[PDB]
Amino acid sequence: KVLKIRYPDDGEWPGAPIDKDGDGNPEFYIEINLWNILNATGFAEMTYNLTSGVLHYVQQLDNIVLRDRSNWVHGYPEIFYGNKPWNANYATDGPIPLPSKVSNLTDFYLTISYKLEPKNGLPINFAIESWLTREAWRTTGINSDEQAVMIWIYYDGLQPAGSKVKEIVVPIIVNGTPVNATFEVWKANIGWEYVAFRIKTPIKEGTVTIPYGAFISVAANISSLPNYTELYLEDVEIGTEFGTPSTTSAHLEWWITNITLTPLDRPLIS
Ligand SMILES: OC[C@H]1O[C@@H](O[C@@H]2[C@@H](O)[C@H](O)O[C@H](CO)[C@H]2O)[C@H](O)[C@@H](O)[C@@H]1O
Ligand SMILES: OC[C@H]1O[C@@H](O)[C@H](O)[C@@H](O)[C@@H]1O
Ligand SMILES: [Ca+2]
Ligand SMILES: [Ca+2]
Known part of the structure; x- marks a missing residue:
């Protein structure tokens, strides 16, 4: 009734499926994902209680040495739905058919209930990420297009x-109240095109709902990539990037009590 994964005990890449009905198709998949840490003392552990539905991440790492300082952050401990295109891990037992072409997907709301506790000024975000690939089921990484x-x-x-690039307005719900929020839009080229939407009023805990197609529509519109609507939305990942090249100690704890994807009867891209 409790799933647990732990770094470094379970290796340098701990991860596990959440498969509550035991049917061999995970509802979500979790990864500690300390992708840019070469060595550290301490541990990081992620627990999921299958009765309460609470996901609890506890991290206490020190003596951190990064794999490549130019990649800046240290890792992205996370939970995801769909096909993560960096590895053979996936979760497709849910209402939204990921992966699917962006031209064929309906819009959906993503609602997350959570609480974040970074310790001692640790730089962090809480970020939702999606990869958009040329093939439907990619498992070997990401290309420049x-x-x-x-x-x-x-x-x-x-x-x-x-x-x-700009600021956009996106209607969201925060703690039960619909609000117009502002997001900065940032664009980079880092081996692939990267578009990030960073809220101007960060929300450290609570329940937030966002309309996914507001973000993907803007990412499509500012993209330099050809044939954008042919790309497949592989996954929806939810986690905390943390650290900078001058962070040597990273203590952080967070919880997620609910992730819901709600299909809408309208195209993702408008
Ligand atoms: O390396 C990928 C990660 O890059 C992070 O941004 C860094 C900026 O904070 C910093 O000022 O510049 C460096 C080098 O240009 C950037 O890498 C992003 O915050 C992360 O989302 C991204 O995974
Ligand atoms: O930066 C490239 C990627 O590295 C992979 O090893 C990680 O699992 C991803 O979350 C990360 O985005
Ligand atoms: Ca299942
Ligand atoms: Ca995968």
């Missing part, structure tokens, strides 16, 4: 990659 979209609904001490 493909896109990452990120949506940061909390941050402290981290700036997205690239250059600011």
Whole structure:
């Protein structure tokens, strides 16, 4: 009734499926994903209680040495739905058919209930990420004619990659109240096109609903990629990037109590 994964005990890449009905198709998949840490003392552990539905991440890392300082952040511990295109991990037991071509997908709301506790000024964000690839089921990484979209609904001490492009308004719901929120749009080229939406009023805890197609429509419109609507929306990942090249100690704890994807009866891109 409790799933647990732990770094470094389970290796340098701990991860596990959440498959509550035991049917062999995970509803979500979790990864500790310390992708840019070469070595650290301490541990990071992610627990999911299958009765309460609470996902709890506890991280206490020190003596951090990065794989490549130019990649800036240290890792992105996360939970995701769909096909993560960097590896053979996937979760497709849900109402939205990911992966699917962006030209064929309906819009959906993404609602997350969570609480973030970075310790001692640790730079972090809480970001939702999607990869858009040329093939339907990619498992070996990302090419220069493909896109990452990120949506940061909390941050402290981290700036997205690239250059600011603009500000957009997006209607969201925060703690039960519909509100017009502002997101900065940032664009970079980092081996693939990266577009990040960073909220101007970070939300450290609570329940937030966002309309996914507002973000993907803007990422499509500012993209330099050809044939954007042929790309497949592989996944929806939710996690915390953390750290900078001068962070040597990273203590952080967070919780997620609910992720819901709600299909709408309208195209993703408008
Ligand atoms: O390396 C990928 C990560 O880049 C992070 O942005 C960095 C900026 O904060 C910093 O000022 O510049 C460096 C080098 O240009 C950037 O890499 C993004 O915050 C992360 O989302 C991204 O994964
Ligand atoms: O930066 C490239 C990518 O590295 C992979 O190893 C990680 O699992 C991804 O989350 C990350 O985005
Ligand atoms: Ca299942
Ligand atoms: Ca995968």
